[PDB]
Structures are given as C-alpha cells and as structure tokens.
Amino acid sequence: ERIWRLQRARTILEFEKMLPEWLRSRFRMGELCKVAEDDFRLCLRINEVKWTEWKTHVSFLNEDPGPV
Amino acid sequence: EIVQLLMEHEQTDITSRDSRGNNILHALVTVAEDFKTQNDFVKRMYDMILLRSGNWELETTRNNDGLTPLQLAAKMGKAEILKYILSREIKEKRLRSLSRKFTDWAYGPVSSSLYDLTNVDTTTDNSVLEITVYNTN
Amino acid sequence: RKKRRLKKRIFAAVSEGCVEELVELLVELQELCRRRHDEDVPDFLMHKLTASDTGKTCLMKALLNINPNTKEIVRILLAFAEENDILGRFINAEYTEEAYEGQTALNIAIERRQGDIAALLIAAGADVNAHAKGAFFNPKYQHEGFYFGETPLALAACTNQPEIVQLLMEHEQTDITSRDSRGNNILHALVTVAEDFKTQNDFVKRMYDMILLRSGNWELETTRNNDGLTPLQLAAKMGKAEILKYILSREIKEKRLRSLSRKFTDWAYGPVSSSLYDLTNVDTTTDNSVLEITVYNTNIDNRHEMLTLEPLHTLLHMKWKKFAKHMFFLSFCFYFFYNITLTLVSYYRLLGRMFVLIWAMCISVKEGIAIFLLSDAWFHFVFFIQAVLVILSVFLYLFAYKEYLACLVLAMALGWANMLYYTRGFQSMGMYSVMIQKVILHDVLKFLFVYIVFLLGFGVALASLIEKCPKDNKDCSSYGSFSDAVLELFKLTIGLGDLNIQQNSKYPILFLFLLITYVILTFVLLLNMLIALMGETVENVSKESERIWRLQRARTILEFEKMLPEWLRSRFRMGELCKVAEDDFRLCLRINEVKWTEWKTHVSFLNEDPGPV
Numbered sequence: 102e103r104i105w106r107l108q109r110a111r112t113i114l115e116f117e118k119m120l121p122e123w124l125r126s127r128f129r130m131g132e133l134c135k136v137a138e139d140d141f142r143l144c145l146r147i148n149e150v151k152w153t154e155w156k157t158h159v160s161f162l163n164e165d166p167g168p169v
Numbered sequence: 170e171i172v173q174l175l176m177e178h179e180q181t182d183i184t185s186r187d188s189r190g191n192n193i194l195h196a197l198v199t200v201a202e203d204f205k206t207q208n209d210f211v212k213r214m215y216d217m218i219l220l221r222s223g224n225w226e227l228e229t230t231r232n233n234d235g236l237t238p239l240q241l242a243a244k245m246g247k248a249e250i251l252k253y254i255l256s257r258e259i260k261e262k263r264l265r266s267l268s269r270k271f272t273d274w275a276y277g278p279v280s281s282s283l284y285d286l287t288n289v290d291t292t293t294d295n296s297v298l299e300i301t302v303y304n305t306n
Numbered sequence: 307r308k309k310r311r312l313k314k315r316i317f318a319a320v321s322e323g324c325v326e327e328l329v330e331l332l333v334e335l336q337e338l339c340r341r342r343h344d345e346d347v348p349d350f351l352m353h354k355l356t357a358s359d360t361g362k363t364c365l366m367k368a369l370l371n372i373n374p375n376t377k378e379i380v381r382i383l384l385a386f387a388e389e390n391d392i393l394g395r396f397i398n399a400e401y402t403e404e405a406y407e408g409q410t411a412l413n414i415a416i417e418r419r420q421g422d423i424a425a426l427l428i429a430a431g432a433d434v435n436a437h438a439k440g441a442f443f444n445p446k447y448q449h450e451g452f453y454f455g456e457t458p459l460a461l462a463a464c465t466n467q468p469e470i471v472q473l474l475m476e477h478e479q480t481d482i483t484s485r486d487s488r489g490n491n492i493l494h495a496l497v498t499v500a501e502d503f504k505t506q507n508d509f510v511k512r513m514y515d516m517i518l519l520r521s522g523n524w525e526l527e528t529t530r531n532n533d534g535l536t537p538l539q540l541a542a543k544m545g546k547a548e549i550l551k552y553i554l555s556r557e558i559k560e561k562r563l564r565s566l567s568r569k570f571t572d573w574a575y576g577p578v579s580s581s582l583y584d585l586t587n588v589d590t591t592t593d594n595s596v597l598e599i600t601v602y603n604t605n606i607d608n609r610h611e612m613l614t615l616e617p618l619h620t621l622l623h624m625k626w627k628k629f630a631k632h633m634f635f636l637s638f639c640f641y642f643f644y645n646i647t648l649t650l651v652s653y654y655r656l657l658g659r660m661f662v663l664i665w666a667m668c669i670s671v672k673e674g675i676a677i678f679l680l681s682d683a684w685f686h687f688v689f690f691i692q693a694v695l696v697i698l699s700v701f702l703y704l705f706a707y708k709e710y711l712a713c714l715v716l717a718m719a720l721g722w723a724n725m726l727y728y729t730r731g732f733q734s735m736g737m738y739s740v741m742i743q744k745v746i747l748h749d750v751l752k753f754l755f756v757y758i759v760f761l762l763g764f765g766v767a768l769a770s771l772i773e774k775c776p777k778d779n780k781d782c783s784s785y786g787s788f789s790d791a792v793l794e795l796f797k798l799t800i801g802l803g804d805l806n807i808q809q810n811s812k813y814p815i816l817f818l819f820l821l822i823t824y825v826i827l828t829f830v831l832l833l834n835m836l837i838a839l840m841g842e843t844v845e846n847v848s849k850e851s852e853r854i855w856r857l858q859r860a861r862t863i864l865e866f867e868k869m870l871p872e873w874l875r876s877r878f879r880m881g882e883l884c885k886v887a888e889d890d891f892r893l894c895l896r897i898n899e900v901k902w903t904e905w906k907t908h909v910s911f912l913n914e915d916p917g918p919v
Binding site: 277 | 452464
C-alpha cells in the first residue's frame with residue numbers, strides 16, 4: 102500500500118510537471134478565501150464530522166453555514 | 170519554566186539565527202524523533218513559542234540550506250510536528266492569523282475545515298509536497 | 307445614508323456585543339425614530355430591525371455570534387420587543403432563503419450547546435414545532451447539509467442535549483408525533499443518525515428510551531414515512547444495529563409501561579429464565595417484515611451483525627429445522643435425478659425425456675421471475691442460461707440439424723457445475739463454495755487476464771521465428787501457427803509438450819531464451835497468485851465466508867417460505883400467542899436462557915408457576 106500510493110503520487114506530480122504554466126494556472130487547485138485581519142490567501146475546503154466532541158463553535162468564519 | 174523566564178526578558182532575541190542559520194523552530198524540527206520516544210512534548214514547546222510571539226517571522230525565515238521549518242520537517246522524517254503545523258486551530262481571536270486550519274461553518278458535528286496552501290502547493294519553487302514525495306531518504 | 311449606516315452599526319454591535327449599553331442607547335434611538343411613523347409602525351420597525359435580504363433578524367445574528375455577554379443582549383432585545391408588542395412577530399420569524407427556509411432562533415440556540423437561552427425564548431412565546439424545510443436541512447449525498455428530521459426536539463436529541471429535550475416534552479404546545487416534510491418523526495430521524503458505537507458512544511439509544519418513556523403509546527412506531535416504513539423497518543433498511551438490538555430486546559421495570567416492551571421473562575426459578583420476545587412486525591406475515599428488509603438488501607454490508615441478534619437468528623434456525631432443510635433436500639433430489647436422466651439421454655444419443663421436458667419449464671419460469679426481480683444472484687443467471695441452452699438443444703433435436711448435441715453437452719457441463727450450488731447447504735461445503743466464489747472473483751481473474759496478455763506477447767514472437775518455412779512439413783516447423791504456438795505453450799505450462807530445438811528456425815538460442823523467460827514468468831505469476839491468496843487467507847476468509855454462508859442460507863429460507871401457499875405457512879407459523887398485559891394478547895417467541903453470573907431476585911414475571919405449559 103505504501104509503495105502503491107507513493108508511486109501514484111509521484112507520477113501525479115510528474116504529470117503536473119510535464120504541463121506548462123498557463124494550464125496549471127487554469128486548473129488552480131484550491132479557492133482564494135478571506136481570513137481575519139484583512140487577509141486573502143489560498144485555502145482548501147474539507148467537510149468533516151465529529152460526534153465525540155461537542156462545544157460552542159466560537160471560532161467560525163461565516164455565520165451562515167451555507168455552502169456558497 | 171526556564172523558557173518562559175527567557176522569553177519574558179526584553180534583551181532576549183527569539184529571531185536569532187545560529188551559525189547554521191536555523192531558528193528555534195528548525196532546531197526543534199531537528200529533534201522530533203517519534204512519539205513512542207519523546208511523548209510529544211516538543212509540539213507543546215512549538216505551540217508555546219509561537220504563542221509568545223504573534224508573528225509570521227519565525228516560520229517565514231530560511232536556514233543556510235534555504236528552507237523553512239515546514240520544508241525542513243518535510244525534508245526529515247518528521248510527522249507529528251508536521252501534523253500539528255498543517256492543522257492549527259487557535260481560539261485566540263487576536264492570534265487567529267497564525268492558524269492555518271480554519272472552520273468556515275459548524276452548524277453541528279458537520280463542519281467544513283479550511284486548510285491553507287501558501288507554501289504547500291506546487292506553485293512554489295520547492296513545495297512541501299514535492300519535498301515529501303521526491304526523497305527516498 | 308444615516309439609516310443604512312445605523313442598521314449596519316446595529317448588526318455590527320450585535321456581532322461584537324462589546325457593550326449592552328451601546329445597544330440600549332441604540333434601541334432607544336430606534337424607539338425615538340419610531341414616533342415619526344403613525345400607522346403601520348411595527349412593520350417598519352421590524353424592517354429596520356430585520357434584514358429583509360435573507361429574512362434574518364438581529365437576535366439570530368446575535369445567537370450565531372456567541373459571546374459571554376449574550377444573555378443580557380437577548381434580555382434587552384426581548385424586553386424591547388415586549389414593550390412594543392412585537393415579541394411574537396419577532397421570535398417566530400425565519401429566513402426567506404431557499405436553503406435556510408424555516409430556521410428560527412430556537413433551532414439556532416439548539417444547534418449551539420446553549421439551553422438556557424432556549425428556555426428564555428420558550429417562556430417568551432417561542433414556537434416549538436418549527437419545521438425547518440430547506441435544501442440545507444434536506445440535502446443529498448450527506449455533504450453540504452445536515453438532516454435531523456427538521457424539528458428542535460429532534461435537533462436536541464440528536465445533539466445530546468437531554469435537558470432541552472425534557473423541556474420541549476414538558477410544554478403542552480409540543481407535538482411529539484409531528485411528521486416532517488419527509489414524513490419522518492423524531493424516531494426515524496434518530497435512526498438516520500446512529501452511525502456506530504465507536505463513533506457516538508451510544509447516546510442516541512438512551513434518548514430513544516427516554517422519549518418512549520415520555521410517551522407511553524404505540525403511536526410513533528406505528529407511523530410510516532413517505533416511503534412507507536416504521537422506524538424499525540427504517541433501521542433495518544439502513545445499517546443500524548445497536549438501536550435494533552435495543553428495540554427487539556426491551557425489558558422494562560416500570561409495571562405501567564411494561565406493555566411497551568418487546569422482550570419478556572415469563573418465569574425464572576433461579577439462573578434459568580424463559581425469555582419471551584415478540585413477532586408483530588418481524589415474522590413474514592407483515593407486508594415487508596424486518597427479516598426481509600435485512601436479508602434481501604445488499605446495500606448495507608453489515609447484515610452479519612444484524613442477523614446474529616437473538617430473535618432473528620432463532621427464527622431462521624427454527625424455520626430451517628422445520629421445513630427448509632427438507633425442501634432443500636427435496637430440490638436437491640429433483641435436480642439429481644434430472645441431471646442423471648440428462649446424462650442417460652446424452653450418452654445413448656421416452657419417459658425420461660418427458661420428465662425432463664416437464665421439469666424444465668418450472669426452473670425456466672422461476673429463473674425468469676427471479677431475473678425480473680433482480681455477486682449473490684450469479685447462480686440464478688447460470689441456471690437460466692442452462693435451461694435456455696437445454697430448450698434450444700431439444701428444439702434443434704426436433705429439427706434436422708447437427709449442432710444440437712453441442713448445446714446439450716454444454717448444458718451437461720454447466721449442469722455439473724451447478725450441483726456445487728446445492729453443496730452450499732452444508733456448512734463445510736458452504737464455506738467451500740463461498741471460498742470458490744470469492745477466489746474466482748478476486749484473485750483468479752487477474753492471473754487469467756495478464757497471462758493471456760503474456761500468451762499473446764510471446765506467441766506472436768514464437769510464430770514469427772517459426773515463420774521459417776518447413777517446406778510443407780508441419781512437424782518440422784512446430785509453433786508455426788499462432789494458435790498452434792499458444793497450444794504448445796499451454797501444454798508446456800501443464801507439461802505435456804515434447805520440447806526440442808527446432809531446426810526449422812533461424813535462431814535456436816533466442817528461441818530457447820525466450821521460452822525459458824516465458825516459463826519463469828508464468829511460474830512467478832502463478833506464485834504471486836498464491837501469495838495474494840495467502841495474504842488474506844487467514845483472517846478475512848473465514849469470517850467473510852461464514853457471514854456469506856449464513857446470509858445466503860437466510861435468503862434461501864425466505865425464498866422457500868415465499869414459495870409455499872397461505873395455509874401451509876399458517877401451519878408452520880413459528881411463535882405462540884401469549885397474554886402480556888392489560889388484556890393484551892400478542893405473538894411471542896420463547897427462549898430458555900441460563901445465567902450463573904448476574905444474581906437478582908426476579909421481580910417481573912408473566913407467570914407465577916415456572917412450568918413450561
């Protein structure tokens with residue numbers, strides 16, 4: 102498993118390096134998003150669930166949990 | 170306790186790079202052998218030192234090899250420290266900037282974590298990803 | 307200009323909540339501006355107080371933006387709304403958005419871990435049956451949304467907030483039996499959430515119990531969703547186990563609610579205890595019983611833990627001990643004599659032919675019906691192909707053709723590959739056939755495909771070298787034909803061939819080296835097939851095979867039960883009528899159990915005398 106996934110990722114990066122710049126720019130993995138203190142940077146969204154821990158979510162970027 | 174004492178003094182220089190050029194963070198990354206050995210205390214000191222200095226300077230600098238502490242933990246076989254760095258959620262509203270892992274919304278147990286990709290994506294000269302993948306050491 | 311900035315500063319000070327005195331002076335200025343309007347004053351007050359874009363209110367913007375000083379802000383806002391008599395129009399408001407439709411301050415506070423605020427709101431006249439109907443609350447793919455039955459009570463129960471649940475049950479305004487847009491009451495919703503104990507720590511079960519204790523009625527579990535399923539059937543259709551183990555086995559101490567239970571002890575003289583379950587919606591008498599829902603659906607991949615439960619397992623075992631064993635033996639005998647007469651015919655080429663022609667139609671129709679209903683069903687398709695080929699062979703036999711025999715003989719082969727099916731009855735032969743199936747599905751196809759690849763790749767070259775003409779001598783230039791070379795390679799891999807350096811060739815050296823490399827590669831590929839087998843051989847094989855065995859045996863049992871008529875089914879009805887409580891006579895299943903560890907004075911028992919009869 103460790104060899105298979107590793108070789109797969111290596112070849113993925115190989116294919117990505119075979120490309121030119123403008124196509125890569127077009128793809129643009131990740132979304133630009135705003136972070137506090139008037140900052141804007143790349144980010145990656147991942148939806149996850151946690152049943153074991155419950156708490157008041159004081160630290161949240163958006164009030165409305167809507168995807169858009 | 171001694172680290173607190175040292176950081177409280179104004180004469181102290183947290184940003185002091187050694188002859189090799191490494192910061193405190195590079196040094197700590199040169200030490201995180203594994204959990205079964207250390208019991209994961211170096212991570213605590215990393216966190217405490219970052220919280221003592223609310224800036225990006227330490228993580229931004231480079232050694233004489235020309236690598237960030239992140240790129241260094243990727244260069245070495247250092248995982249726990251990297252797992253910590255790439256996933257930081259600080260509740261402190263003032264020091265929220267330093268965090269890389271952000272919660273966009275949490276209606277309930279479902280929540281969208283918003284990780285960061287400044288120097289992690291392949292856009293940079295040497296990303297964390299290429300470093301991890303292109304080294305058999 | 308001034309009004310828009312005013313509204314923005316209102317909502318911003320709410321989001322920050324730096325000082326309640328700011329909000330006091332600000333709402334005072336709002337009340338002072340309220341005097342300007344003479345008619346339709348409260349509506350404009352709300353509009354200036356409400357974000358008409360999304361249908362959001364300042365109280366919601368507050369509850370979303372939690373801070374320690376929030377209670378005072380909410381008290382101020384509610385006292386203001388009461389002073390102006392807009393408390394009802396203010397609390398019950400919700401969004402106009404397509405996804406956030408129906409969301410209220412109560413569902414917000416309950417989405418948070420704050421209950422005191424919810425109590426304050428309910429005391430102020432808050433709606434408790436607020437149905438939040440939206441794409442967010444009614445999503446697909448379990449991504450970008452969260453489903454909980456669309457009620458505050460269900461939200462609190464799913465999120466482990468039992469105090470708020472007790473509160474919402476205490477109010478007479480509450481509607482426990484309130485069905486949602488999907489038709490699911492709170493029980494169905496809880497059943498939609500109980501992923502696994504390792505993930506939840508089994509709190510949903512406790513809330514199920516508490517809720518049923520709060521409502522001493524069969525009303526809820528009798529309900530049906532838009533799909534038409536009781537919450538029991540809902541848990542069964544899903545991959546939910548612990549909740550089902552709770553439901554199917556309930557022993558209640560409260561003599562008043564003793565009727566709600568489904569498990570009962572009718573006598574226990576000591577360690578012995580003859581436990582007594584129920585079979586209302588479990589036996590096959592119902593339209594879609596729990597048993598069918600468990601057995602037929604492969605969408606779960608958890609049916610082992612499901613069927614290992616006591617009542618279902620005992621029902622299956624008893625139904626096999628009564629009739630299904632005999633029915634399986636009987637079908638086996640039929641197919642035995644069928645194929646034997648088929649062999650007698652095919653060897654010597656009237657009564658046996660007639661018997662075969664009569665018995666083939668039943669198999670054909672049953673296979674067609676099964677396919678219309680339809681790697682568990684492979685056997686049905688195989689039997690269907692067999693019967694089709696047999697009928698084609700006989701039809702050809704009537705005509706003056708010669709190909710008929712071919713189809714016939716093929717069926718024979720397939721027929722003798724189908725007897726393996728009946729071997730699945732025996733437990734040893736059961737795991738035997740299941741190992742056959744699993745291995746042929748997982749490991750063998752890889753070997754066969756890649757070996758065909760190598761066959762082609764090397765046989766093309768062998769034929770190419772053998773292109774040297776033998777001067778019209780097939781014996782001289784062996785490996786001449788491509789298929790001939792592949793056949794020689796096959797004989798070699800089996801070892802029947804008679805290898806020898808062929809003078810009819812330009813290069814014996816390269817020929818020999820290539821042949822040796824081929825043999826080495828074939829051996830190594832076979833060896834890797836063996837290795838990939840042994841890798842999973844130990845752990846997964848036994849458990850998976852036994853699970854599949856039990857599963858398919860239950861499937862067969864249910865099939866044969868469906869084959870029977872109404873009256874024979876009525877005769878073989880497992881279970882017995884029993885008086886449970888308060889003139890209640892229901893069906894039950896008996897299990898005599900023994901426990902030497904847990905000692906207790908047996909208080910609750912149906913029958914005083916422990917006699918079996």
